[PDB]
Amino acid sequence: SGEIEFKNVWFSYDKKKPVLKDITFHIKPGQKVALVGPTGSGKTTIVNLLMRFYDVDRGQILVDGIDIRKIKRSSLRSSIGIVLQDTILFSTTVKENLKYGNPGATDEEIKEAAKLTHSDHFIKHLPEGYETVLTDNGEDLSQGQRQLLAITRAFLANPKILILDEATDTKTEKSIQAAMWKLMEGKTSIIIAHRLNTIKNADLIIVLRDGEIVEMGKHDELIQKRGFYYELFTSQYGLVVEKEAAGLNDIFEAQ
Numbered sequence: 619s620g621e622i623e624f625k626n627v628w629f630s631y632d633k634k635k636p637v638l639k640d641i642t643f644h645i646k647p648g649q650k651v652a653l654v655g656p657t658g659s660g661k662t663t664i665v666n667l668l669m670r671f672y673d674v675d676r677g678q679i680l681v682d683g684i685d686i687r688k689i690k691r692s693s694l695r696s697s698i699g700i701v702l703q704d705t706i707l708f709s710t711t712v713k714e715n716l717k718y719g720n721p722g723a724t725d726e727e728i729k730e731a732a733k734l735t736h737s738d739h740f741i742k743h744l745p746e747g748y749e750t751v752l753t754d755n756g757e758d759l760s761q762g763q764r765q766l767l768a769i770t771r772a773f774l775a776n777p778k779i780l781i782l783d784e785a786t787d788t789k790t791e792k793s794i795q796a797a798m799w800k801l802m803e804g805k806t807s808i809i810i811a812h813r814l815n816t817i818k819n820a821d822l823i824i825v826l827r828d829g830e831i832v833e834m835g836k837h838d839e840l841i842q843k844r845g846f847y848y849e850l851f852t853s854q855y856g857l858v859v860e861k862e863a864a865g866l867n868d869i870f871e872a873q
Contacts, residue, residue, distance in 0.1 A: 624677065625678050663829075699781070705756070708755065716732070720775050723774055728774065736766070778806065822834065
């Protein structure tokens with residue numbers, strides 16, 4: 619499960635000017651994949667089509683080898699876990715928030731899920747623990763804690779596929795990174811990368827520009843190619859240092 623393939627996909631919301639043009643790629647089960655490129659390059663539209671918020675105008679999208687137009691749509695969408703940078707929670711108990719994608723979960727399954735995704739500790743130390751009401755939709759929690767909850771929430775729903783918007787706290791980021799790691803374990807992950815920090819180890823990087831894939835591959839190979847990915851990466855992570863080099867001086871001499 620978690621196999622994804624776009625074959626010659628074209629799409630437009632307008633049905634006038636296109637947004638995606640001949641998009642073709644294949645993702646093996648369990649691979650971590652990064653989408654990179656400018657705003658409006660096709661990143662979000664690819665994910666909208668995967669969720670089947672719309673059907674493609676041309677080509678096909680296959681999940682596990684089946685055109686998603688022949689898959690039960692709610693099961694397709696249900697099998698996809700979404701973690702964005704800003705998570706909205708309901709003004710209810712933590713426990714009920716955690717059952718968002720798994721209403722049938724037992725109290726034991728919830729705590730087990732939270733232990734594996736390293737949110738159990740901070741939940742327990744909320745004033746009412748798991749029964750703490752997240753008044754004002756989670757705004758008494760820090761940014762990090764909301765993200766932990768969203769990761770545990772996804773984990774509990776056991777998705778086959780993840781869609782993750784990469785962030786653009788030391789005690790927390792360590793546990794968030796551990797949490798993400800566990801959440802991604804054994805799953806196909808599609809990361810909308812921005813900082814490009816994480817994705818050095820991505821199994822596949824897809825570089826988009828004006829609705830087309832201009833490059834595709836691993837970090838090392840894309841860097842050597844000195845194309846668009848090289849440009850976006852080194853512009854962001856280039857580092858200026860000092861080096862000793864030959865120069866000229868006008869020194870004093872006799873005669």
